[PDB]
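Handout, section 4.2: multi-component inputs.
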Amino acid sequence: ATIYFSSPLMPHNKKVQAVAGSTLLGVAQENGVKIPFECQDGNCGSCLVKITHLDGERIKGMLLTDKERNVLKSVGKLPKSEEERAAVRDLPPTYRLACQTIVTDEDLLVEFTGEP
Amino acid sequence: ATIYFSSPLMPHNKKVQAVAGKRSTLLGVAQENGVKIPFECQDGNCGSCLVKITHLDGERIKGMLLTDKERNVLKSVGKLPKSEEERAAVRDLPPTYRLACQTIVTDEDLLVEFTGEP
Ligand code: FES
Ligand code: FES
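Output:
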């Protein structure tokens, strides 16, 4: 698993190869990436990260082509929420708490403001 | 993968053992096992093979691994969109509507429902 860490407080992004252990925060701290860690109960929100999934499904769980979405819409089997979710122009980022995020086999771009 | 086919036109559901393949479709599995899902086009544009799929194993809400606590913390900092909140707050296992001729059989166990109407 390849993780690219990025922050306005880092002049260079950091490419990290991660192995089984494990949280995003744990991986970051182990590799000198200073994601703010301000609680031991996962309630403060200081470790907030913006994650872009680099490989795998573009929209997680949404394997539908434009054609299938149109066919499903025509029979009233495509909810507006699912339509809008798939119609996103730019690769959708997910906000997570790094102290709660388990490192999987997925390649990620991990962004954080650097502010406490 | 285990697939359970169910329809108002079938007095009994049909449990099927299928093999995951990049070219293997839900409709192909159904036809091979005598499950009469309507098949009316070769282009995936007619909508006859419409199925309601319940993912029996794996992630409850595909791509959402967030705990209730994390969802609450993210909401408090305005980093949980209303659409993602409602999607995770669903009380019943969320069913997905698909065209069986377009659905690729993976390792995931499924409940596959269809009306039986052409
Ligand atoms: S360090 Fe407090 S929520 Fe992650
Ligand atoms: S058979 Fe026509 S959409 Fe599947």
